[PDB]
Amino acid sequence: QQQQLPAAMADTFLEHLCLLDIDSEPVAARSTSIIATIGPASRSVERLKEMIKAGMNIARLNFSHGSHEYHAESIANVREAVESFAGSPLSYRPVAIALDTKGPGSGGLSEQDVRDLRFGVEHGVDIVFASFVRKASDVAAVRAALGPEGHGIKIISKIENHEGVKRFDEILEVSDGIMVARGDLGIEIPAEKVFLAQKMMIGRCNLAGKPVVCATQMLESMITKPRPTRAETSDVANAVLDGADCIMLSGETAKGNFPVEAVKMQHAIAREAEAAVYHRQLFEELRRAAPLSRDPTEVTAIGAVEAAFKCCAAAIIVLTTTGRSAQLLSRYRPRAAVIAVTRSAQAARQVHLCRGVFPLLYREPPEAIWADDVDRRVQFGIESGKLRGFLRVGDLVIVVTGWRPGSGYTNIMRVLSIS
Amino acid sequence: RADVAQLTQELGTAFFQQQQLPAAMADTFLEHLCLLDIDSEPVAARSTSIIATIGPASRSVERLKEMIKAGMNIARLNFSHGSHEYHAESIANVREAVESFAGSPLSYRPVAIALDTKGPGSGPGLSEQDVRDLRFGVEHGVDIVFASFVRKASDVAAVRAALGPEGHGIKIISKIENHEGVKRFDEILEVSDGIMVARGDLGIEIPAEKVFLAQKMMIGRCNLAGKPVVCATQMLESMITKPRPTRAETSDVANAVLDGADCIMLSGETAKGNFPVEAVKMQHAIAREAEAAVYHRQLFEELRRAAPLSRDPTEVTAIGAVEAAFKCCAAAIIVLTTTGRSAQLLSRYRPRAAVIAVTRSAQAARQVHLCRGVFPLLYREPPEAIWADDVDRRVQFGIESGKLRGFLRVGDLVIVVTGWRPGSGYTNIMRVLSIS
Amino acid sequence: GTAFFQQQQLPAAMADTFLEHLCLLDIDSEPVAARSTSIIATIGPASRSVERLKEMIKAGMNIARLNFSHGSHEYHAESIANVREAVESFAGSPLSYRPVAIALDTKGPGSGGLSEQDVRDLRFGVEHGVDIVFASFVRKASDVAAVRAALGPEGHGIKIISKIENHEGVKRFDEILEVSDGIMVARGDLGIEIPAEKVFLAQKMMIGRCNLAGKPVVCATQMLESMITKPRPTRAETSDVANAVLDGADCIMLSGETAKGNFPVEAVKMQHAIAREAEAAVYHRQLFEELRRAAPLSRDPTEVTAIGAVEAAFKCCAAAIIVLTTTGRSAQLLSRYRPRAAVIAVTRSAQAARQVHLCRGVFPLLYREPPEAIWADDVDRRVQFGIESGKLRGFLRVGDLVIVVTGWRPGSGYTNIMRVLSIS
Amino acid sequence: ELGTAFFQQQQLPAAMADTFLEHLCLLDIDSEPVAARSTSIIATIGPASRSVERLKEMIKAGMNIARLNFSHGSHEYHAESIANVREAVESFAGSPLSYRPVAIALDTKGPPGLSEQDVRDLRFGVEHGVDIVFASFVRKASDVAAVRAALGPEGHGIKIISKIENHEGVKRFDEILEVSDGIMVARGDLGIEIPAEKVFLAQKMMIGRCNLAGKPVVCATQMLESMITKPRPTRAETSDVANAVLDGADCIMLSGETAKGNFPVEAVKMQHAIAREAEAAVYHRQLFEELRRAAPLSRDPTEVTAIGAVEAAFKCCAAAIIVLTTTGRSAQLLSRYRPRAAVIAVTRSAQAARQVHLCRGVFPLLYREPPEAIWADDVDRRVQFGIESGKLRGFLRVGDLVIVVTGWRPGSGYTNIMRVLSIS
């Protein structure tokens, strides 16, 4: 069978590895988001359309280079390329915009970072990748620099030195997520210890249910070569197997000769690696480690993921205002795709940070009766799922909704047969 | 500790010291045993049903009212003794005692009526007396038949045929009492509604020292199949003449519950003994202690791993509801059911949360006592004009009765299991509700 | 062969879950291994005759309990003499000789710490060479120290099994177990001191903790009560004996069933038959894994050799682990890991041979030959004696694999070697 | 006691975790590796690494196996490289602390079946006494039989490591592994023959099956590729080396990095540093449990002794397992259970000492003393040689516990004894 299902049914991790089959083709949609750095080699609207088709989910703007005018033009080109597919939900795919800060340099929040963060708020960026975060107060400073208008922007703290690793727990507590920034980390600590920091941080983020990005030199040789090395494909596959929500491309897309091919390579590897995840052990460990909760969204999420595994559900369709109900489903790593139907364009872009969440931006007219409005959003998830290949007639889906309008009231799980 | 820290701060350390919760959080079965505490008091309602045999010592309406208050859920009539007239009078007295509490949902308790057949004797199939007794059962509206000496699938087909078209709703619990019944167990279980480990005859038909193997195997297979299993005979034998049981007897009752029995039974202890009420009270007290000592962490993991994948929405909803109940330490799972099936599918995953089954069927309310942890609530109100409002009223009836009866408190979380259209077979929804 | 893997509940033993293990239990799968849970029989008027005692030894009695709550010192000295006479009547065949321990069960403190009658009874025990003391109503660690002080310097080798019979004993269990050699779950008094419906929790907890500590635990009282007057036990009684073995009890006990009843020999035979069936139904896959995981790291070579030997025995389905032991300690450390292989303990100490009956799965062989001048040849002769006794008793056959556990020098405390041997 | 500092090093908090997720969460960059590097490094010897002086530096950096790629050079060129490896190895024969055996491996050019050039190159290997053959493009069992037949009458002791480089080799993996001594995941050709994004699946599958079979597996090609021209590797390259060790590879390899690059010594040093860190991060609790559960029951005493010895080593945190081996087989059976203790293999065979580098965690000690007339004395002399070399090299100190594995009689094939020794 397909999608490494014989290896998925194994009783031990060793037997799971022994049953991995190169002829077992991946069938599920790619769950791990790809962050591509937008620069000189990937700035044109035409090139950006090809990157979106290749699989780019998040566009990264590196404020260590360029200028405010240069990056504003890159942002406008990303938005133009994204909106060129808005004529049909099959082609349409939201793309988040992330601002990566220059950092503190010689040393706390620098004055250039305050100006760049203000630029991000004014240009409506979705995420901030904060460079060289070494303590909780660095995150509070970034949050303060975003002001009252940037309250919805996600802060992903980049761990790049020994202090960031040692104070990881306090940093994760106040951040929306983490980036394992391996370039600086590999210079700040011995190169042979970076894999320990990566695996530890990914594990702790998976336990906390917060997004984690693996970054830097993943496909480095593709800056000049059309095909990556054996170590590079292995690195991408292992970041997904480690539990990374996102994988990143830096020079490979910002300045390289093969930006589109680098995105295609990360897409192909991630799909293969996701099918090779040993869900039997992973779900059992995530379930056991996740604390008991009296929050109905948390309780519904584990019930929905358990139900999805019981029937081999093709998808879990969830309604979300902020992305939170989809994030709580994602933390249990279901094999079923989490189709998140939202009216918030920003939540649709941001939800790419969570593995296995497929955002659908709802732009249909409202129904007068709220229960009918909910039902049409569910049917929209199903129709978009059928169109995109996620669902077929006869499939079972799990539908996650709330008892009243507004964020924070998810409390219902329903088992539905498609058509 | 981090997996229970926030809930410990919210519910309190006292909450996590009761109902063997430290033993429940253990990482191994050995650690679970080491953490069992005699000072950890049971809090949950008793989930294993008690079947009491009704005979000369327990026939009067006054005595039957005491037995219902002591915990009797199923009244057994042994057709190896008495006559049709004698058993009809016992049935009438049981119904009179049951109806004495029929004035409020907080006081009412349905009691099932089970007919235990005389058996085939030296014959190879259904006896003529059994055909007459089975017809008596249908005419008197019995809920369950305990079929004696079932040896093969065709024996249960014969019992079903003798019940006729009017007894289609009666549950057939096959009694396994000999070597052939044990060897052909899988084919018997497949066609039966449940099983009784009838240890009296089994202990004479096979070596006495092998009965515990047959009991544990049959209970395990019934738990795996999601069908009710009864442990029976000599559980509290010495209580026929003594007011207190032996150390082996209390151990036997506790171990039948730990094995996974849905029901425990009293035969001579209630039918002819000197302490019928005390025997029921003793089974009640032991079952509550033993239910709290069940190692749910391994049990639920093994029930999930062994249960095959399912495309039945009732089955899918049931596992999701039980998982949700464990996540929040839900006080109860309220389920709407017509035939009892949605409650049975919740019961097969052995939730710690009480399964409050709201039904309009008086027969389903009596029969669900066969399933561990199912508390039947008979709803008598006429249907609302709008179906969705009628569903909501039934759920609210379960919540209000749950609060009034001590199952639920303000601040508790409850899991509610319903369907999307009327009629049996459409359960597909799980809701998490906060009690206000 | 396929027949080998159908016996002793081996299909149920290979199961991946406890639920599937239960589902695979087969009443037609006959036990093959020797009975490993020891039987303690209380001696009284129904079991004092030398000829009746010989029948009890043949039926499976391993420990004779003297209940000092009844009778005088003269009565107990006669019981001891009759037990020794019946035991020594089989000594002419050293390959089949079965040692039987003598345990003194104290009257207890009554309304009082250590009573003055207990001091006199304990001194009687030392003077008459008893092997074990079952100390009644132990409520705290200082009760055990008082029993040990009353045994004096001459009774240093006597094992003290603390009887837990009340709420205080259960609450202070950890401190009592730490200073005791073992525990008895004394269910008679316990079932009167605490609610009857809670006794099973105290029993399972104490057995679990004793198994974790690697110390012997006895399940006692009313196990086959109805057999005091009836020839066959009730369904609850056979279930109780089977469940005490499944819980992890090293020993099961008979009180009135052997001391005063009409079927003392049959009560011993019934406990023997049930225990053999229940031992084959133990889910060793989970049990060994959990005992291994819970047992702390050790720098003691006997402890390190024992876990290596038990792992080796499971790897080859060894018929037995033959161990040489002076005090019984090397056999106790093998027993704590609950091997399926019988632990054949060869000793020259008649007292250690009697006392090792406290540990599940230990079969003592008392070696009587004087030492060889070459120590290595004396060790080999003892190992050969274990093999020949094992073949004669049905434990071993030619072609079987056995694990042999010995030490690097004479004297107790130096076990450090494990060897894989093919039986010829 | 060992101290709190002992339990903070070598990822011991992560090793004690109850789940794999908790194990990952407990990995600490400040927890320093203490154990010797157990994954062998194979370095390709070519133009950049051929000189005697450069080879001495490569041996000091950690090279265990010298690979000669017969796709390049000539017989004369490779014979000189072999002579330079042997000269560099023998330059450390005057110091027991610095001396290290180095295996010589011949990697064939490759093929319808065995090529004419491969027959001549295999014959060259036999004549020059090579230890290992890395057979290119093995597609089926008959390709291995052809290589084995080509190793003539003198080379049957040469190890055949089958290189899996195409779709057919992956699909017929089980039949190839059955007849081979080991496997090489030859990722260069594999990444061209099958989609590049599927290579990691083939690598993890083959390593898992080799670990299950107890046969050596090598991870090869482009592990530190950028180090051909750069002094430091990329983040993907260090990750790749660490993950090959975490996957279960016995050996890791360097090709262009040492054969033709500008930093051959630095590439070896980098693989050494990463492997040490990754070996401490192995989750032994799950690995040992799964290796134990998956390995079938065995009646072979070497296999039974090995699992008992590995269990004993884990119980006491043994500094080492010292094993006496003539063929290397007793050390290979210890290595298959992945002990954390270093397996110190004492042998009189120079070829077995070189070949055991294929097995993770085996540290060979070549013993050349004249044999003792009393065999038990000769055994004791070799065990003490392992202990004294262990103290000298930093593996052992007085007061440490070691596990010692020997047999009951001389000659290969009789390992059946495990002993626990305290270092004096």
Ligand SMILES: Nc1c(O)c(S(=O)(=O)O)cc2c1C(=O)c1ccccc1C2=O
């Ligand atoms: N180009 C390579 C090369 O890539 C590799 S490998 O791919 O890293 O194995 C090895 C070699 C060579 C050689 O050029 C060479 C020239 C003369 C003698 C020997 C060699 C040689 O071993």
Ligand SMILES: O=P(O)(O)OC[C@H]1O[C@](O)(COP(=O)(O)O)[C@@H](O)[C@@H]1O
């Ligand atoms: O994931 P979030 O942010 O909590 O949003 C989920 C919310 O969406 C709903 O399903 C529908 O809400 P709206 O009708 O306001 O869009 C709510 O019932 C639920 O509380």
Ligand SMILES: O=P(O)(O)OC[C@H]1O[C@](O)(COP(=O)(O)O)[C@@H](O)[C@@H]1O
């Ligand atoms: O447990 P059963 O027999 O399947 O009954 C469950 C049924 O009860 C309901 O919850 C309500 O049904 P009714 O309104 O007909 O009583 C259905 O939606 C569901 O199909």
Ligand SMILES: O=P(O)(O)OC[C@H]1O[C@](O)(COP(=O)(O)O)[C@@H](O)[C@@H]1O
């Ligand atoms: O189990 P114990 O009491 O520690 O006795 C084990 C001892 O028995 C022996 O195997 C044999 O010793 P003896 O020759 O003194 O009987 C010793 O090597 C070992 O120390």
Ligand SMILES: O=P(O)(O)OC[C@H]1O[C@](O)(COP(=O)(O)O)[C@@H](O)[C@@H]1O
């Ligand atoms: O690993 P191998 O090749 O089987 O060798 C192990 C052999 O080594 C020994 O320990 C020592 O044997 P030698 O004295 O012949 O070297 C034997 O007892 C054992 O059979």
Ligand SMILES: O=C([O-])C(=O)[O-]
């Ligand atoms: O900043 C980064 O992305 C890094 O250092 O890897």
Ligand SMILES: O=C([O-])C(=O)[O-]
């Ligand atoms: O028939 C019965 O109930 C029995 O035999 O136990």
Ligand SMILES: O=C([O-])C(=O)[O-]
């Ligand atoms: O003393 C005892 O044996 C008891 O109370 O059970």
Ligand SMILES: O=C([O-])C(=O)[O-]
């Ligand atoms: O031959 C090799 O080593 C390869 O192809 O990787």
Ligand SMILES: [K+]
């Ligand atoms: K930057």
Ligand SMILES: [K+]
């Ligand atoms: K009957």
Ligand SMILES: [K+]
């Ligand atoms: K007494």
Ligand SMILES: [K+]
């Ligand atoms: K080659």
Ligand SMILES: [Mg+2]
């Ligand atoms: Mg950086």
Ligand SMILES: [Mg+2]
């Ligand atoms: Mg009967």
Ligand SMILES: [Mg+2]
């Ligand atoms: Mg007492």
